[PDB]
Amino acid sequence: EADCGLRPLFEKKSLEDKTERELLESYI
Amino acid sequence: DFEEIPEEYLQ
Amino acid sequence: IVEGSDAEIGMSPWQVMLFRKSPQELLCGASLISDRWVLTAAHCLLYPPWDKNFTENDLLVRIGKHSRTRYERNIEKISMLEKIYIHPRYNWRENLDRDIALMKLKKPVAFSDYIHPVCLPDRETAASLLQAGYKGRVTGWGNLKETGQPSVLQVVNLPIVERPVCKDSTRIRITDNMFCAGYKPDEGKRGDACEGDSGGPFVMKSPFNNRWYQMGIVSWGEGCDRDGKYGFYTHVFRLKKWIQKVIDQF
Ligand SMILES: CNC(=O)N1CCN(C(=O)[C@H](Cc2cccc(C(=N)N)c2)NS(=O)(=O)c2cccc(-c3ccc(OC)cc3O)c2)CC1
Ligand SMILES: *[C@@H]1O[C@H](CO)[C@@H](O)[C@H](O)[C@H]1NC(C)=O
Ligand code: NA
Ligand code: NA
């Protein structure tokens, strides 16, 4: 789907979940 | 220990 | 999930529970990839050495769940299966090579705050993100430790491991259709999938377009969260040609 991977309760409303930052910090 | 699901889904 | 934590509400809206009709029990995890297709592990449905061969009418999929055992009235949606598709070269005789299966739903599921599909990776996203040291995320209702069971969905973030380290941790022949993930003994942090997490998703959030992609499927491990052992995952991109062919043909 063109809307795949965008969560209604997070990305869609620009809220971060409690540990996704850990993922981003590893991509380095 | 699962709660029973509605019968609709088992018919 | 061992050494994980409670998921947040709506944190993994692609999470699917494979549920046996009789007796009523969890069978496996799975994931929602469109309004009518669900992805899981082949071994959740077929393993002849143990006389396991589920047909469509044996199973249900429960979508939008958080609580493991509760019927989440007005939140979860339960779907019946139209058809099961196992990878034709799923190697149940040796090492679960190509441990993947698709399930077509009898009817599309309505998306909601709690129900939403995950993306599947393109070649570029796979090559960019499926790198040693990069962390993905595993979710499931499986065991909390080597066996006990969670009240709600569990989540843990784990690093992808270098392929030679994966191979040197096991006697099993590791193929290009597998990757492994988890912390090394000297890294201090812990965490793993376990029994009951089988078939669930290993996802990564793209830093380029901020979308979640399913890179792996929980496939197997030797014990759970054992030092010097790692969880093994089906390499979703490597089998995406089979995925596309199934959904296009059917
Ligand atoms: C095929 N049937 C079957 O039921 N599933 C096989 C996978 N599976 C496990 O790996 C479990 C729990 C588990 C599941 C998923 C991830 C992890 C992890 N730690 N990331 C741990 N681990 S186990 O208890 O050591 C054990 C018990 C019995 C058989 C095997 C087994 C392993 C590998 C294999 O080929 C490579 C064949 C096997 O038979 C392993 C249970 C679910
Ligand atoms: C699983 O069971 C179905 C139902 O008869 C059968 O057609 C299929 O060949 C079986 N698969 C294997 C690998 O035994
Ligand atoms: Na080895
Ligand atoms: Na380990």
Side-chain angles (χ1 to χ4, degrees), chain A residues 2-11 13-17 19-20 22-23 25-27, chain B residues 2-3 5-6 9, chain C residues 1-17 19-25 27-35 37-79 81-82 84-103 105-106 108-122 124-129 131-144 146 148 150-166 168-188 190-194 196-240 242-243 246-248 250:
Chain A
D3 207 64
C4 68
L6 303 167
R7 295 169 297 179
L9 291 180
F10 293 90
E11 287 80 21
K13 55 200 294 182
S14 186
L15 294 169
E16 287 184 12
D17 69 51
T19 65
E20 65 178 90
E22 176 183 7
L23 304 188
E25 293 173 344
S26 78
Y27 303 164
Chain B
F2 283 81
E3 172 169 16
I5 65 193
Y9 306 106
Chain C
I1 307 292
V2 184
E3 298 290 327
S5 64
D6 289 5
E8 288 166 82
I9 298 303
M11 190 194 216
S12 188
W14 34 83
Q15 190 75 33
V16 173
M17 181 188 294
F19 200 71
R20 195 210 290 236
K21 288 193 196 167
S22 190
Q24 296 193 23
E25 60 182 21
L27 281 190
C28 270
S31 67
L32 187 68
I33 59 169
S34 82
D35 72 350
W37 288 97
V38 170
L39 188 62
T40 190
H43 82 258
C44 288
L45 305 168
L46 176 70
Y47 192 62
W50 293 8
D51 299 303
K52 182 199 269 195
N53 190 351
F54 285 113
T55 81
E56 287 78 13
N57 286 3
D58 298 326
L59 317 155
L60 295 168
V61 292
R62 307 178 56 170
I63 314 179
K65 290 193 61 50
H66 180 63
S67 169
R68 177 177 64 96
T69 64
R70 171 182 178 245
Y71 173 64
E72 293 173 284
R73 181 162 49 98
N74 297 2
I75 298 177
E76 64 168 290
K77 300 300 179 189
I78 305 184
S79 308
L81 299 191
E82 175 176 320
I84 286 160
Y85 304 87
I86 309 291
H87 193 292
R89 304 182 63 196
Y90 164 49
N91 189 344
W92 55 264
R93 295 185 156 267
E94 169 183 32
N95 54 2
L96 308 183
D97 192 22
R98 307 179 194 86
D99 187 13
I100 192 171
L102 286 157
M103 299 179 284
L105 306 188
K106 271 192 182 170
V109 61
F111 298 158
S112 71
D113 282 353
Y114 318 103
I115 295 178
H116 200 89
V118 73
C119 307
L120 303 177
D122 56 283
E124 296 65 47
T125 295
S128 177
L129 296 193
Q131 298 196 37
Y134 289 13
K135 287 174 181 180
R137 173 181 285 171
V138 183
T139 47
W141 291 278
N143 287 354
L144 297 171
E146 284 212 7
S151 172
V152 305
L153 190 64
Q154 297 295 291
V155 58
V156 65
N157 302 330
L158 298 171
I160 297 163
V161 174
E162 293 86 350
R163 294 202 69 92
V165 175
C166 298
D168 283 346
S169 73
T170 183
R171 308 174 65 167
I172 302 292
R173 183 183 68 89
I174 305 310
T175 73
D176 293 348
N177 304 312
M178 312 167 186
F179 68 90
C180 93
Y183 292 106
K184 298 168 188 179
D186 57 66
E187 287 180 320
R190 308 200 65 89
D192 196 6
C194 200
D197 295 319
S198 273
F202 176 104
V203 299
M204 302 178 85
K205 176 169 187 169
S206 171
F208 306 101
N209 62 10
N210 292 332
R211 297 177 185 258
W212 294 86
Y213 288 87
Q214 177 170 359
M215 318 300 305
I217 301 166
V218 176
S219 184
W220 58 277
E222 305 166 306
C224 301
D225 194 47
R226 292 191 180 167
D227 282 358
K229 301 292 194 166
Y230 301 91
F232 285 82
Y233 301 82
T234 311
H235 198 309
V236 166
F237 174 71
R238 282 261 307 177
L239 306 166
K240 190 176 168 187
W242 175 77
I243 296 167
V246 169
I247 302 168
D248 287 352
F250 307 95

